[PDB]
């Protein structure tokens, strides 16, 4: 029954503060700078998630400035933001008020993995297609997420709508300006990140997305390990030993190191026999040593693996309509505009 009011600025629209009221506050998760709360907006009854972020008094918050300019059906929407105190004494925190999505792709993946069952391929196509759309959108701004993983893929299981979240590591990459290499989470780090490269591109998101696809097909992470050595061995066991030309494309400081000598394992034996060959073909074009050889997010959306989604008769397993898949904007298509031939089917 307790109603809380704060003055807050809308995530989008005019920079005009307004009174926002919320109730039914409850802890739902953990964050690096405080717990994450769920709340219910009084004006609309909509559920929101509130997370704390350390406000740097020197620079503008990178996560905030990125989220205020993003508007895409497969990206979590910033509703409001305001400042308050919190966990540490004498500290001012930035509060990000986000549309609440109850589940993640990881929860669905572990649900089938625990039951020793395969996630139905139609859900694999839907989740990965929506993920690549969100990547193509942010990459068109030059923004790299730098922390793609199943736990950061919000999911409404009823409508199968996916939304990318957690832009705390996101950065607009500028060629020629170095970046920290310690971003991205274990299992999902591109090999150039394992090699500590400071000169990398948005293609690290595509490698991480390839790791998500392989995990959804395998029922477990494809490149597990608690250290970079253990992760690299699992990568080499699949892709083979990287050639010196490939190491120079990742981090030329590592060209002369001693790596385990293993020939590549055939892609058709990495996954179970019944895995659809289009899914395997797509993974081989995402998990590539050479970053420029990986598909772009927009190229991945047009891959034959997602042809079933462009069927005019595609239906969800429960029977609902598939979510919005073809409402591409000029910004979203800017990396390859004439790709809308495949991406937008005739019935759209």
């Amino acid at each position: 029954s307790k109603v809380t009011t704060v003055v807050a600025t809308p995530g989008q629209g005019p920079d005009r503060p307004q009174e926002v009221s919320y109730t039914d506050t409850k802890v739902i998760g953990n964050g690096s700078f405080g717990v994450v709360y769920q709340a219910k907006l009084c004006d609309s009854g909509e559920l929101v998630a509130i997370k704390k972020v350390l406000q740097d008094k020197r620079f503008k918050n990178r996560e905030l400035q990125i989220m205020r300019k993003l508007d895409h059906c497969n990206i979590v929407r910033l509703r409001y933001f305001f400042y308050s105190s919190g966990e540490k004494k004498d500290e001012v925190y930035l509060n990000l008020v986000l549309d609440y999505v109850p589940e993640t792709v990881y929860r669905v993946a572990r649900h089938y993995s625990r039951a020793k069952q395969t996630l139905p391929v139609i859900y694999v196509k839907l989740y990965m297609y929506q993920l690549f759309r969100s990547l193509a959108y942010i990459h068109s701004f030059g923004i790299c997420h730098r922390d793609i993983k199943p736990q950061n893929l919000l999911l409404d299981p009823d409508t199968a709508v996916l939304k990318l979240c957690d832009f705390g590591s996101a950065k607009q990459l500028v060629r020629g300006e170095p970046n920290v290499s310690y971003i991205c989470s274990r299992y999902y780090r591109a090999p150039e990140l394992i090699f500590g490269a400071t000169d990398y591109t948005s293609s690290i998101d595509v490698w991480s997305a390839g790791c998500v696809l392989a995990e959804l097909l395998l029922g477990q992470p494809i490149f597990p390990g608690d250290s970079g050595v253990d992760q690299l061995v699992e990568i080499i066991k699949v892709l083979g030993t990287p050639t010196r030309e490939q190491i120079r494309e990742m981090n030329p400081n590592y060209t002369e190191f001693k790596f385990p000598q293993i020939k590549a394992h055939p892609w058709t034996k990495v996954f179970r026999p019944r895995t659809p060959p289009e899914a395997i073909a797509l993974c081989s074009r995402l998990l590539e040593y050479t970053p420029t050889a990986r598909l772009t997010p927009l190229e991945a959306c047009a891959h034959s693996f997602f042809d079933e989604l462009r069927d005019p008769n595609v239906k969800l397993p429960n029977g609902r309509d598939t979510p919005a898949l073809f409402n591409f904007t000029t910004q979203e298509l800017s990396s390859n505009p004439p790709l809308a031939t495949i991406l937008i089917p005739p019935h759209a």
Partner: peptide, 13 residues
């Protein structure tokens, strides 16, 4: 530990 939320329709907190 490895989950985003405490709660999920697929498991127990």
């Amino acid at each position: 530990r490895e989950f985003r939320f405490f709660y999920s329709v697929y498991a127990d907190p």
